Amino acid sequence: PSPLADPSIVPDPYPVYADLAQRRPVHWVERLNAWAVLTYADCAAGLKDPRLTADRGTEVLAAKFPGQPLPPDNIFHRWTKNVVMYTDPPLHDALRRSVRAGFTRAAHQHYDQVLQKVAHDLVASIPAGATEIDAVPALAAELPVRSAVHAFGVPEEDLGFLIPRVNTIMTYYSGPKDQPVTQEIILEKLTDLHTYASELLQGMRGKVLPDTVIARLAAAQDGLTETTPEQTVHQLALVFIALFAPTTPGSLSSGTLAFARNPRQVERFLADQACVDNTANEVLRYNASNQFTWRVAAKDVEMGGVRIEAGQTLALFLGSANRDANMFERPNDFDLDRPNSARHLSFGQGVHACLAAQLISLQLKWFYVALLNRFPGIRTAGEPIWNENLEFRSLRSLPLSLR
Ligand code: HEM
Ligand SMILES: N[C@@H](Cc1c[nH]c2ccccc12)C(=O)O
Numbered sequence: 001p002s003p004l005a006d007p008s009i010v011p012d013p014y015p016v017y018a019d020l021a022q023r024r025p026v027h028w029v030e031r032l033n034a035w036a037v038l039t040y041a042d043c044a045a046g047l048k049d050p051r052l053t054a055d056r057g058t059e060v061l062a063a064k065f066p067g068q069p070l071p072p073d074n075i076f077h078r079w080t081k082n083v084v085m086y087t088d089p090p091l092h093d094a095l096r097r098s099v100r101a102g103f104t105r106a107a108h109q110h111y112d113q114v115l116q117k118v119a120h121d122l123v124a125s126i127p128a129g130a131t132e133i134d135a136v137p138a139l140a141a142e143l144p145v146r147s148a149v150h151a152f153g154v155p156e157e158d159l160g161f162l163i164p165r166v167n168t169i170m171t172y173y174s175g176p177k178d179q180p181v182t183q184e185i186i187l188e189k190l191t192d193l194h195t196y197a198s199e200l201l202q203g204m205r206g207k208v209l210p211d212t213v214i215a216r217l218a219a220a221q222d223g224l225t226e227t228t229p230e231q232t233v234h235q236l237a238l239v240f241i242a243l244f245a246p247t248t249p250g251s252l253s254s255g256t257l258a259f260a261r262n263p264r265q266v267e268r269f270l271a272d273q274a275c276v277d278n279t280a281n282e283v284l285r286y287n288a289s290n291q292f293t294w295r296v297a298a299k300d301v302e303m304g305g306v307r308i309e310a311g312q313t314l315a316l317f318l319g320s321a322n323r324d325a326n327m328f329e330r331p332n333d334f335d336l337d338r339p340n341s342a343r344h345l346s347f348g349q350g351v352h353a354c355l356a357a358q359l360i361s362l363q364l365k366w367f368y369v370a371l372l373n374r375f376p377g378i379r380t381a382g383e384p385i386w387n388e389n390l391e392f393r394s395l396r397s398l399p400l401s402l403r
Pocket of ligand 1 (some may be wrong): 085239289293294346354356360
């Protein structure tokens with residue numbers, strides 16, 4: 001019976017992942033209704049294997065809410081079948097092109113400057129007499145919300161509507177454990193994000209800051225020719241979910257912990273710009289926030305000596321792949337001098353590689369620039385405590401001393 005379904009692995013899964021990558025690199029996890037895939041080689045190729053489809057909302061819903069299917073007209077199916085995350089090419093590619101205006105080279109030139117300032121301002125807000133901080137609520141949870149506002153264009157005044165709704169929706173992705181929130185409630189909040197997205201663009205909600213992702217997307221709508229208004233609304237809903245997911249906080253907090261525990265890496269960062277430049281990727285490699293991602297077999301495939309039949313579900317363990325010693329020597333070392341950290345799988349790979357990958361790496365880079373030049377002596381001030389979630393894994397508490 002798979003140790004991947006044991007809640008006790010979440011604080012430190014890596015010894016279990018390493019053992020299973022060796023002995024059981026592909027194996028069945030009953031609680032996921034899926035084949036777990038543990039090695040870098042199999043995860044990276046699986047992400048780019050056209051025999052594995054991203055059209056998986058049916059299968060994954062059946063895994064998470066067995067006995068509770070939904071019809072094709074239900075918001076769950078209309079959303080999944082009309083967003084980049086859960087579509088294959090060619091539709092995927094039309095949907096991705098339709099959001100290009102938010103993510104151009106010029107746009108990221110602007111976001112680089114916004115994020116530098118946002119992170120600067122966050123860290124500068126920590127009072128002089130503060131030696132202790134819980135880096136989760138104070139910093140890791142906070143930076144992504146300030147980025148959502150200033151770089152993405154989510155109105156600040158609408159955060160009270162969005163934050164709790166995304167937190168509810170995100171319980172869908174609770175890993176191999178009982179669902180804490182009913183399907184009915186999740187679908188209601190998913191519906192609510194669609195209403196909000198459409199009303200935001202109509203000017204019925206908050207004010208979107210200029211030159212942000214959402215402002216750019218809004219201005220692009222008149223020129224779209226291969227997608228529909230409903231598709232834009234579906235895609236915004238996904239964007240809201242991704243913006244307020246625990247992914248970015250977990251990356252910030254797990255990287256902060258890594259620095260706290262590895263002071264010579266602080267020294268490296270302050271000594272060598274190449275180590276700065278590699279910080280986002282080494283942090284992303286060191287702990288994938290999304291530890292596994294889902295696929296379905298569109299055709300029979302063979303992986304890890306297992307024949308996976310068309311229609312079966314797979315869980316590609318990005319978090320295990322990132323610490324596979326065959327790809328990353330001494331994979332449990334947090335090492336800014338590592339030469340291949342950019343090979344991590346935390347943003348996936350290929351067709352569905354994270355749309356926000358550059359935005360998030362800029363956010364991480366500027367955070368650590370600000371934090372570590374202010375407070376190079378960061379250390380633990382108690383036990384870091386993890387959320388009870390393997391799928392989207394993150395710290396709930398990170399007590400630190402700043403000096
Ligand atoms: C550290 C933070 C984040 C991490 C670790 C993360 C991780 C991922 C991963 C693993 C995928 C690929 C999943 C798969 O193929 O199965 C993905 C895709 C995606 N990401 Fe992120 N992501 C983050 C932040 C964000 C944010 C803030 C947004 C907001 C826009 C976002 C938007 C997306 C979208 C739209 C896709 C789908 C792209 C496609 O299907 O073409 N990501 N991300
Ligand atoms: N892993 C998710 C896809 C995903 C990646 N990043 C996310 C952020 C938020 C929500 C979902 C996602 C899935 O297989 O369904």
